[PDB]
Design a protein around this ligand. Structure first.
Ligand SMILES: N[C@@H](Cc1ccc(O)cc1)C(=O)O
Ligand SMILES: [Zn+2]
Length: 329
């Protein structure tokens, strides 16, 4: 300090060797995630609905049962909407809240509002129940390692982990600047105006965000994630390297390098998503959204039946390795 917000610029991974990679691949369970983390979220959960409450309680209860020292905060606020003033609640789960720096994984836990059509209900399986369940499975699978971050008299982390589950990512109607990103626009502004660490004179919680890794629209077959931003390109390249090495070790399922997920191509345009209010305030973003979107995007067919189990399993392994390497665990 006050150079500590520049540490993210020089931060390097602590790369896992083959033995450790095999351990991570064996330590995550796609069937356990499916039953215990994902299926309870495959419900109608637009903001303010009973399902939104049920989804929030589920996310909190799955984090609270873990051994690591997660601190849960519910960030509840009002916003104008096309249907008038409404309440929204982001979920923030933080290890070591006073650590200056956090790696941040995020997704949205609301589902887009639709009236029931032909007795069908929109549950947003890729969008984003699967991202939610991936974050919960990561917390569970890495629980023993994340517990070592716990602050004692001997070690106090400089860098730790935070999960954000945004409410209200979706428009109530179709997208507009005022009807979308309710939770992320609120939370980015809040973090930008909150000193961090406690007592700081001139640094905010946003300065402490090392990297925002935003998962969206994951779970369909054959996703291709572009390398959107130059100031996170080196971390995109790490995802590529992790995918390549897990592949070569035989630790991925139904996977080829020709059909790899992290491909060598950029994307010039802007995708509206929860990263935008953070990106426009200078937070580095790794946006794990596929291009093109799943074929089922914003249809009633974005459901459990159309999820690709082995692709989600593969991405769990890649993401968990990424997080351990980032945190030097
Ligand atoms: N929603 C954006 C980005 C996008 C990218 C890929 C898609 O398949 C669809 C949309 C448009 O324009
Ligand atoms: Zn959507």
């Amino acid at each position: 300090g006050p150079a500590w917000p520049e540490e993210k610029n020089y931060h390097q991974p602590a790369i896992l060797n083959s033995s450790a990679l095999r351990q991570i691949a064996e330590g995550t369970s796609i069937s356990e995630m499916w039953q215990n983390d994902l299926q309870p979220l495959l419900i109608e959960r637009y903001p303010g609905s009973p399902g939104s409450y049920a989804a929030r309680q589920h996310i909190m209860q799955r984090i609270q049962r873990l051994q690591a020292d997660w601190v849960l905060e519910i960030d509840t606020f009002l916003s104008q909407t096309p249907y008038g003033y409404r309440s929204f609640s982001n979920i923030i789960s933080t290890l070591n809240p006073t650590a200056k720096r956090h790696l941040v994984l995020a997704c949205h836990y609301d589902s887009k509002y639709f009236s029931h059509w032909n007795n069908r209900v929109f549950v947003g399986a890729t969008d984003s129940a699967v991202p939610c369940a991936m974050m919960l499975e990561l917390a569970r699978a890495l629980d023993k390692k994340l517990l070592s971050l716990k602050t004692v008299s001997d070690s106090k982390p400089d860098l730790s982990l935070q999960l954000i589950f945004f409410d209200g990512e979706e428009a109530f109607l179709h997208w507009s600047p005022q009807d979308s990103l309710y939770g992320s626009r609120h939370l980015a502004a809040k973090m930008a105006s909150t000193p961090h660490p406690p007592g700081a004179r001139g640094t905010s919680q946003l300065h402490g965000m090392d990297l925002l890794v935003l998962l969206d629209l994951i779970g369909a077959p054959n996703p291709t994630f572009p390398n959107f931003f130059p100031n996170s390109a080196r971390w995109f390249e790490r995802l590529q390297a992790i995918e390549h090495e897990l592949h070569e070790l035989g630790l991925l399922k139904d996977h080829s390098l020709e059909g790899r997920y992290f491909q060598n191509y950029s994307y010039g345009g802007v995708i509206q998503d929860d990263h935008i209010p953070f990106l426009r305030r200078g937070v580095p973003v790794l946006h794990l959204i596929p291009s093109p979107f799943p074929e089922v995007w914003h249809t009633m067919d974005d459901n459990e039946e159309n999820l690709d189990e082995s692709t989600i399993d593969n991405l769990n392994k890649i993401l968990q390795v990424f997080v351990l390497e980032y945190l030097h665990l």
